[PDB]
């Protein structure tokens with residue numbers, strides 16, 4: 487009789503990251519319990535630049551402090567942008583889904599260095615340090631955050647427990663809906679810091695199950711320039727299915 491290799495979700499999600507030849511962690515939180523999966527669990531308590539995941543908090547601060555509103559159309563004023571898809575007028579929510587950093591640079595500048603630093607420290611996001619450059623502090627340092635801190639943050643958003651008004655949290659949640667099917671909803675925000683070394687990739691968000699239960703996640707992995715951006719979505723969705731969260 488031969489032996490059988492028996493592999494549960496822990497081994498499988500470790501091997502999903504090995505197959506991409508990169509280092510990654512998936513942090514899960516539900517019912518105030520956090521579990522770690524992937525091939526690089528020490529990443530879960532390591533600080534990384536948040537990159538575009540910071541747009542969730544930029545939006546909360548800008549809406550709370552009435553620097554913008556959910557219907558405002560941010561105009562494309564004519565500079566060549568990183569992607570043609572960004573060369574259009576769009577709302578905060580559209581810019582969230584596209585990760586359109588020039589819209590959120592305009593918003594960060596309206597908020598201003600002083601209010602932004604005070605608000606980031608009030609929330610206590612990551613190392614709460616934004617330095618002197620108001621338009622890139624989430625992209626190239628000095629702001630850094632761990633994957634565990636991101637899962638705690640996004641779980642609070644999902645539960646309307648951040649220290650912001652309930653309407654502002656509801657409105658930002660609505661900007662983050664990625665998919666709905668069969669009574670499940672997936673909400674989340676991607677990020678990819680391409681301008682530092684090592685590059686960092688994120689996908690932070692939560693699943694709302696058909697009975698209303700919230701399962702939050704933070705995927706964090708080392709990226710390289712030849713990977714498709716969808717590698718993050720692929721690894722997340724395969725892992726969530728292995729975990730029977732979807």
Ligand SMILES: *C(=O)[C@@H]([C@@H]1NC(C(=O)O)=C(S[C@@H]2CN[C@H](C(=O)N(C)C)C2)[C@@H]1C)[C@@H](C)O
Nearest residue numbers: 537538539569571584585587676677678679
């Ligand atoms: C934020 O982290 C950066 C941007 N965020 C992402 C991302 O995480 O997906 C990208 S790539 C972006 C995704 N949607 C566009 C697309 O796929 N096409 C138009 C083809 C591009 C950026 C690196 C950064 C800009 O701050």
